[PDB]
Amino acid sequence: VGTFKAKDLIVTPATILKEKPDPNLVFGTVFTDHMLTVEWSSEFGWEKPHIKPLQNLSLHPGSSALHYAVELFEGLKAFRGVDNKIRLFQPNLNMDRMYRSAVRATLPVFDKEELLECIQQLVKLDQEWVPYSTSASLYIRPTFIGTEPSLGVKKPTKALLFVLLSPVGPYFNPVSLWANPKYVRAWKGGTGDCKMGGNYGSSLFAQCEAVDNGCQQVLWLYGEDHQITEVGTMNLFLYWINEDGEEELATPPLDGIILPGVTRRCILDLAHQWGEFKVSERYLTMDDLTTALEGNRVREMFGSGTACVVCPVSDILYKGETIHIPTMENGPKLASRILSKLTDIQYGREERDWTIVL
Amino acid sequence: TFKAKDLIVTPATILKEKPDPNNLVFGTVFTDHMLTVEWSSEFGWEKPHIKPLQNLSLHPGSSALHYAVELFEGLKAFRGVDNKIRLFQPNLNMDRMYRSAVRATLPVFDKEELLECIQQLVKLDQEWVPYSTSASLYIRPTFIGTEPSLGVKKPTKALLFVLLSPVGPYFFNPVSLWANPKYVRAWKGGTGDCKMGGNYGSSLFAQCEAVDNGCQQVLWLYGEDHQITEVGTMNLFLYWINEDGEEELATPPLDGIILPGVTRRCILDLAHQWGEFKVSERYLTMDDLTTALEGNRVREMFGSGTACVVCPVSDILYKGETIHIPTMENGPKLASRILSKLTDIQYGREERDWTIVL
Numbered sequence: 001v002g003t004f005k006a007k008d009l010i011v012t013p014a015t016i017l018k019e020k021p022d023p024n025l026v027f028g029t030v031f032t033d034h035m036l037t038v039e040w041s042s043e044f045g046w047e048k049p050h051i052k053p054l055q056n057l058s059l060h061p062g063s064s065a066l067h068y069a070v071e072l073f074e075g076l077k078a079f080r081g082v083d084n085k086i087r088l089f090q091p092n093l094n095m096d097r098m099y100r101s102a103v104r105a106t107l108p109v110f111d112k113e114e115l116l117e118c119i120q121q122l123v124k125l126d127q128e129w130v131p132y133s134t135s136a137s138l139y140i141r142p143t144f145i146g147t148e149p150s151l152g153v154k155k156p157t158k159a160l161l162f163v164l165l166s167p168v169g170p171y172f173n174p175v176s177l178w179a180n181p182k183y184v185r186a187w188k189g190g191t192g193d194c195k196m197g198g199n200y201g202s203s204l205f206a207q208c209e210a211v212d213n214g215c216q217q218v219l220w221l222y223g224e225d226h227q228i229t230e231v232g233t234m235n236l237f238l239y240w241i242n243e244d245g246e247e248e249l250a251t252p253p254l255d256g257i258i259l260p261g262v263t264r265r266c267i268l269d270l271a272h273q274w275g276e277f278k279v280s281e282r283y284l285t286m287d288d289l290t291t292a293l294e295g296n297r298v299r300e301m302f303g304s305g306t307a308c309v310v311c312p313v314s315d316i317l318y319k320g321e322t323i324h325i326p327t328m329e330n331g332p333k334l335a336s337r338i339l340s341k342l343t344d345i346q347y348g349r350e351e352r353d354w355t356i357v358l
Numbered sequence: 359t360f361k362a363k364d365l366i367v368t369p370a371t372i373l374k375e376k377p378d379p380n381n382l383v384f385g386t387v388f389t390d391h392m393l394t395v396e397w398s399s400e401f402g403w404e405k406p407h408i409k410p411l412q413n414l415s416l417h418p419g420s421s422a423l424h425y426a427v428e429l430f431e432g433l434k435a436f437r438g439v440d441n442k443i444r445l446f447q448p449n450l451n452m453d454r455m456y457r458s459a460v461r462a463t464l465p466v467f468d469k470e471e472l473l474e475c476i477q478q479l480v481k482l483d484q485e486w487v488p489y490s491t492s493a494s495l496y497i498r499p500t501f502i503g504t505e506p507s508l509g510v511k512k513p514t515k516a517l518l519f520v521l522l523s524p525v526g527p528y529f530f531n532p533v534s535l536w537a538n539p540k541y542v543r544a545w546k547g548g549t550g551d552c553k554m555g556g557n558y559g560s561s562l563f564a565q566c567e568a569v570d571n572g573c574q575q576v577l578w579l580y581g582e583d584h585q586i587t588e589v590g591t592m593n594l595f596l597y598w599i600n601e602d603g604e605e606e607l608a609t610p611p612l613d614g615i616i617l618p619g620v621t622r623r624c625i626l627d628l629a630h631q632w633g634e635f636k637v638s639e640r641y642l643t644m645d646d647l648t649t650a651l652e653g654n655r656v657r658e659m660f661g662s663g664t665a666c667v668v669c670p671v672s673d674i675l676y677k678g679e680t681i682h683i684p685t686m687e688n689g690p691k692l693a694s695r696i697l698s699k700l701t702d703i704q705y706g707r708e709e710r711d712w713t714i715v716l
């Protein structure tokens with residue numbers, strides 16, 4: 001057990017540099033000039049990290065990442081502030097999650113501080129890619145795959161940790177959800193609370209069926225009571241008047257089937273800080289939703305995540321019936337306020353312990 | 359769809375020497391060649407290639423590394439007692455690979471063309487099909503999404519390849535199982551009924567946990583009543599006297615959480631034709647099992663799968679106790695009869711339409 005170290009970084013600058021794209025971009029379509037890569041073996045442990053020109057990965061055909069999904073990823077952003085200072089948002093939480101995911105994937109552990117510094121060195125080198133727009137940013141995709149060259153299903157004796165950079169804009173423009181309870185995203189005892197690739201490949205069929213019915217995303221339902229868990233790849237928030245006639249900002253609890261998002265945490269922290277209404281991490285079902293609608297109790301519904309931050313939901317297609325959510329007709333007040341707060345913090349218009357600057 | 363007729367063959371310059379068919383570690387040795395077929399949304403399938411075993415050059419953003427957009431298959435080639443090389447139920451593998459491709463939203467292919475391409479790959483490396491009646495050539499068709507963009511969606515790029523690995527045993531050597539209801543392999547509304555990469559990477563944590571407890575495999579439990587579903591990566595079979603006091607061979611039903619193994623189907627077929635006892639596809643819980651043991655009603659328990667046609671079970675670690683299974687004390691009579699029959703068919707000692715020559 002050990003870790004690679006940032007002070008050991010081997011930088012190899014690309015001679016040919018690619019022209020930056022126009023800030024006004026399709027998510028994950030464009031990649032920067034460089035990338036970070038770190039090899040690992042159970043025999044020699046972590047090798048020295050490298051920052052080199054973006055290039056293809058040369059992988060053995062038997063690599064466990066291609067056969068048994070031994071893999072995991074992360075997603076954070078770097079923002080060019082109104083002061084032109086590049087900032088990262090709550091990077092330390094992504095490193096924690098990534099570490100936890102590694103352990104649950106049986107991939108080799110590493111030192112969070114070192115990885116973060118290596119990332120900071122990667123972004124710094126390609127800092128000119130960080131968009132020159134207050135509505136765009138640079139997406140950081142840390143990835144960790146098993147490269148064991150054997151078909152035996154088991155803990156990998158070889159692995160590759162790498163990091164890609166992609167300048168992006170959007171991932172309000174409300175979305176419509178497709179809710180089919182026949183499809184299940186995560187289960188108790190599963191890995192839904194980790195960012196392991198295995199939990200995503202199996203959702204593509206559902207996502208396709210969603211676009212097949214005019215929806216932009218999938219509303220993941222769970223259990224006999226059809227609990228509302230997540231919106232596609234985002235955590236779900238419901239701003240309504242609860243059963244007790246109280247103004248409430250609710251979101252499903254972290255009971256195993258919900259991925260603990262960094263945006264989810266922040267929203268809950270801002271929501272608690274303001275102390276203007278009740279904040280509850282509890283169970284929400286379709287019936288709770290419908291009963292509330294046929295009472296004008298609902299105010300806003302939206303998804304949260306690094307890619308969208310705040311993503312208003314306006315309709316849910318459930319049991320052949322299109323269920324409209326008055327999110328947009330009520331502002332969206334909270335959703336907008338939350339967007340401004342996070343955006344202000346991310347672009348340096350507001351000082352806070354949530355961002356770091358190199 | 360690609361066509362076998364279009365195969366482009368690039369034979370290796372230097373051929374590796376064959377391993378000892380007596381000391382083979384499952385899936386660690388690979389033959390001289392592999393099959394590769396590139397797919398693109400814009401152009402469709404490229405022509406198929408049989409070229410020397412080399413590393414795959416993939417864009418670091420390939421969806422197979424990020425979102426487990428991948429699936430695999432497993433079938434074997436056997437050198438018969440007449441020295442004729444045979445494939446066992448290969449068309450069933452093609453059908454399962456095809457259905458899984460659809461569920462993963464990977465591109466469809468002509469099942470016969472793939473099989474012919476595989477036969478031609480095996481024909482080229484035919485000398486790798488071990489001169490042994492206790493060894494064979496494992497065939498690993500693999501289908502991965504190579505989509506460069508980081509968006510979670512249906513791939514517009516993909517690769518289909520086939521590797522070959524001479525093998526002997528996956529590990530009668532009875533195995534002990536580690537049963538802990540805290541982990542769930544697959545769930546209703548899930549994808550556990552497909553050979554999609556995502557279902558395995560999530561198992562490693564439980565698997566390594568079984569090892570540090572002396573067990574070679576995990577006994578996958580499901581639900582409040584703790585149904586016993588599969589033995590590691592193999593289907594589960596129970597030979598006992600049931601509640602009604604009847605002699606019976608039972609195996610969990612295909613209700614969505616069980617992978618329809620080819621071996622499993624074959625065993626049910628053989629058991630059905632012998633018609634010497636009741637054959638049931640039914641639920642089985644730890645309680646039925648432990649209650650049956652206390653009643654001395656259990657005879658044999660074993661896992662089945664291409665890697666280990668019949669893998670007898672001797673012990674189960676559950677609730678801190680070690681539940682002994684009398685399988686080996688009972689012969690294992692049925693386990694042997696079945697193993698003997700399947701191998702007699704595979705190695706041509708018996709003719710049946712379950713094997714395809716060359």
Ligand SMILES: *Cc1c(COP(=O)(O)O)cnc(C)c1O
Pocket residue numbers: 075195230232233234235259260261262263264304305306307
């Ligand atoms: C990444 C992800 C989220 C959001 O987490 P953030 O850290 O806020 O980006 C939510 N749900 C799923 C399933 C995710 O993969």
Ligand SMILES: *Cc1c(COP(=O)(O)O)cnc(C)c1O
Pocket residue numbers: 432553588590591592593617618619620621622662663664665
């Ligand atoms: C492949 C597999 C089996 C066995 O099926 P065969 O087609 O008979 O090899 C059983 N269970 C799981 C989970 C599998 O992946």
Ligand SMILES: CC(C)CCC(=O)O
Pocket residue numbers: 075233234304305306307308508509510
């Ligand atoms: C799953 C990732 C491609 C996007 C996560 C998000 O920010 O919602």
Ligand SMILES: CC(C)CCC(=O)O
Pocket residue numbers: 151152153432591592593662663664665666
């Ligand atoms: C999962 C694979 C490595 C083995 C499947 C089997 O033969 O049971």
Ligand SMILES: [Mg+2]
Pocket residue numbers: 468470
């Ligand atoms: Mg044809």
